[PDB]
Design an enzyme around this catalytic site. Structure first.
Site, PDB file in Angstrom:
ATOM      1  N   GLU A  28      -8.109 -12.689   5.706  1.00 39.85           N
ATOM      2  CA  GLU A  28      -6.792 -12.139   6.043  1.00 39.85           C
ATOM      3  C   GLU A  28      -6.980 -11.717   7.885  1.00 39.85           C
ATOM      4  OE1 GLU A  28      -6.593  -7.867   5.742  1.00 39.85           O
ATOM      5  OE2 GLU A  28      -4.303  -7.911   6.074  1.00 39.85           O
ATOM      6  N   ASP A  43       2.938  -5.420   1.873  1.00 37.60           N
ATOM      7  CA  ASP A  43       2.148  -4.154   3.001  1.00 37.60           C
ATOM      8  C   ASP A  43       1.210  -3.262   3.339  1.00 37.60           C
ATOM      9  OD1 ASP A  43      -1.033  -4.883   2.420  1.00 37.60           O
ATOM     10  OD2 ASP A  43      -1.138  -5.993   4.379  1.00 37.60           O
ATOM     11  N   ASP A  44       2.112  -2.945   4.379  1.00 37.99           N
ATOM     12  CA  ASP A  44       2.230  -1.908   4.548  1.00 37.99           C
ATOM     13  C   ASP A  44       3.561  -0.995   6.032  1.00 37.99           C
ATOM     14  OD1 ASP A  44      -0.719  -0.605   4.686  1.00 37.99           O
ATOM     15  OD2 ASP A  44      -0.822  -2.153   5.346  1.00 37.99           O
ATOM     16  N   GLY A  85      -9.272  -2.713   3.006  1.00 37.06           N
ATOM     17  CA  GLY A  85     -10.321  -1.791   4.276  1.00 37.06           C
ATOM     18  C   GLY A  85     -10.520  -3.008   5.200  1.00 37.06           C
ATOM     19  N   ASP A 114      -0.391   4.061   0.795  1.00 41.32           N
ATOM     20  CA  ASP A 114      -0.130   4.887   1.812  1.00 41.32           C
ATOM     21  C   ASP A 114       0.467   4.082   3.016  1.00 41.32           C
ATOM     22  OD1 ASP A 114      -2.424   2.991   1.317  1.00 41.32           O
ATOM     23  OD2 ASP A 114      -3.799   4.622   1.764  1.00 41.32           O
ATOM     24  N   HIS A 160       1.121  -0.887   0.288  1.00 41.87           N
ATOM     25  CA  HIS A 160       0.297   0.156   0.055  1.00 41.87           C
ATOM     26  C   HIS A 160       0.591   0.996  -0.192  1.00 41.87           C
ATOM     27  CE1 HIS A 160      -3.699  -1.844   1.158  1.00 41.87           C
ATOM     28  NE2 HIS A 160      -3.013  -2.739   1.568  1.00 41.87           N
TER      29      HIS A 160
HETATM   30  O1  LIG Z   1      -4.275   1.908   0.700  1.00 38.78           O
HETATM   31  C1  LIG Z   1      -5.361   1.595   1.033  1.00 38.78           C
HETATM   32  C2  LIG Z   1      -6.199   1.307   2.222  1.00 38.78           C
HETATM   33  O2  LIG Z   1      -5.597  -0.122   1.941  1.00 38.78           O
HETATM   34  C3  LIG Z   1      -6.465  -0.194   3.653  1.00 38.78           C
HETATM   35  N1  LIG Z   1      -4.924  -1.623   4.186  1.00 38.78           N
HETATM   36  C4  LIG Z   1      -4.149  -1.076   3.830  1.00 38.78           C
HETATM   37  N2  LIG Z   1      -3.127  -2.478   4.781  1.00 38.78           N
HETATM   38  C5  LIG Z   1      -4.393  -2.905   4.655  1.00 38.78           C
HETATM   39  C6  LIG Z   1      -4.284  -4.738   5.279  1.00 38.78           C
HETATM   40  O3  LIG Z   1      -3.521  -5.598   4.248  1.00 38.78           O
HETATM   41  N3  LIG Z   1      -5.659  -5.282   5.112  1.00 38.78           N
HETATM   42  C7  LIG Z   1      -6.476  -4.424   4.666  1.00 38.78           C
HETATM   43  N4  LIG Z   1      -6.747  -3.280   4.192  1.00 38.78           N
HETATM   44  C8  LIG Z   1      -5.186  -2.255   3.774  1.00 38.78           C
HETATM   45  C9  LIG Z   1      -5.389   0.793   4.704  1.00 38.78           C
HETATM   46  O4  LIG Z   1      -6.791   1.869   4.845  1.00 38.78           O
HETATM   47  C10 LIG Z   1      -5.142   2.329   3.368  1.00 38.78           C
HETATM   48  O5  LIG Z   1      -5.419   3.068   3.576  1.00 38.78           O
HETATM   49 ZN   LIG Z   2      -3.207  -4.802   1.757  1.00 36.43          ZN
END
Ligand SMILES: OC[C@H]1O[C@@H](N2CNc3c(O)ncnc32)[C@H](O)[C@@H]1O
Ligand SMILES: [Zn+2]
Length: 349
Positions: free
Chosen positions: A214, A292-293, A181, A16, A14
């Site tokens: 997840e 991922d992040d 999300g 962001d 991601h």
């Molecule tokens: O990057 C788009 C959006 O997706 C969501 N993300 C990021 N990481 C993440 C995770 O893997 N699982 C679900 N959603 C996620 C976040 O809210 C981020 O702002």
């Molecule tokens: Zn993700």
């Protein structure tokens, strides 16, 4: 001493969620928007996490910094540019970065993200900005980069426009649509906006990926695959809980976008149980290893490689295999897809 010092392909990260603390700090000050800290170090301890939380609990960390980035054109382009740079340094030759264009807009969006004050950065403007940043980066650090636009489980009213943005920016960096999300939001997979957005991705040939399994159950995965028609499952660890479902995904050769570190930190994976990617490796499944992040997980692509290596018994052969599969599972058009495979095999010699 890298776990796998060879070209890599990353399919699940991601934008962001992969920002420099130094760039966050830079824009908070610059725009005069507040941050929970004024030091990259403390900023890292606030935003970052070192202990499992929950998906809803992890998702909130974005509240801290998204406000200093969202609505700022200079900032939106810069994080895209710095993203390629970071991936290039990690030895990634091809990467698909995902993000919500709506959560970075300060205009033509409803509900306005981050209680922002109306401006002129429309969702379309955000896609354009990221493309420009991503393009400048490729053409400067020399790695190939595509982007994926995210529908948000909580805001289905945004989904059809995301689809439109994928259509309009098709391969002009945008190669697919995602559904990200809070996977805990009961029935979010089935909301009309999402469902209808995917139905159109299918009819217009817009690639599809979906975070599922997840933290949700097999049924969330089943719906991603059967109702939403995903070509790939983000995470998908919970699929193995439905033997039948798993075997059938195994048969269809479904690609699983695995993020090892992230799964521990979000409670996606219970540390007292064997990681689902172990079974994936053992069943020779179609799967990638992703970050991922990384901002919030305080990690790098090597964090996930070191983790599988050290704790799950991953060899360089499996590393090579998963990355060839990642290449094959990418949303690059045929010609470029082949060019990517050719580079991996060449470099894997
Ligand atoms: O990057 C788009 C959006 O997706 C969501 N993300 C990021 N990481 C993440 C995770 O893997 N699982 C679900 N959603 C996620 C976040 O809210 C981020 O702002
Ligand atoms: Zn993700």
């Amino acid at each position: 001493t890298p776990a796998f010092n060879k070209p890599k392909v990353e399919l699940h990260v991601h934008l962001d969620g992969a920002i420099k603390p130094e760039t966050i700090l830079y824009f908070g000050k610059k725009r005069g928007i507040a941050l929970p800290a004024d030091t990259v170090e403390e900023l890292r301890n606030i935003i970052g996490m070192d202990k499992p939380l929950s998906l809803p609990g992890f998702l909130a960390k974005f509240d801290y910094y998204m406000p200093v980035i969202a609505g700022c054109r200079e900032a939106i382009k810069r994080i895209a540019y710095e993203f390629v740079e970071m991936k290039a340094k990690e030895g990634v030759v091809y990467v698909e970065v995902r993000y919500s264009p709506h959560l970075l807009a300060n205009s033509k969006v409803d509900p306005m993200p981050w209680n922002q004050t109306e401006g002129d950065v429309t969702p379309d403007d955000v896609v354009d900005l990221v493309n420009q940043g991503l393009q400048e980066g490729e053409q400067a650090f020399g790695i190939k980069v595509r982007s994926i636009l995210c529908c948000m489980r909580h805001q289905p009213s945004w989904s059809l426009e995301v689809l439109e943005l994928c259509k309009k920016y098709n391969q002009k960096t945008v190669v697919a649509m995602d559904l990200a999300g809070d996977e805990t939001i009961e029935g979010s997979s089935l909301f009309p906006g999402h469902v209808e957005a995917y139905e159109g991705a299918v009819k217009n040939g817009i690639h599809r990926t979906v975070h599922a399994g997840e933290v949700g159950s097999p049924e969330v995965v089943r719906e991603a695959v059967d109702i939403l028609k995903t070509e790939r499952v983000g995470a998908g660890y919970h699929t193995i809980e439905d033997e039948a479902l798993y075997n059938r995904l195994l048969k269809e050769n479904m690609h699983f976008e695995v993020c090892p570190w992230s799964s521990y930190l979000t409670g996606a994976w219970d540390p007292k149980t064997t990681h689902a990617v172990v079974r994936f490796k053992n069943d020779k499944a179609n799967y990638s290893l992703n970050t991922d992040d990384p901002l919030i997980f305080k990690s790098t692509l090597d964090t996930d490689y070191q983790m599988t290596k050290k704790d799950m018994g991953f060899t360089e052969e499996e590393f090579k295999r998963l990355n060839i599969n990642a290449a094959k599972s990418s949303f690059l058009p045929e010609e470029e897809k082949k060019e990517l495979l050719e580079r991996l095999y060449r470099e894997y010699q």
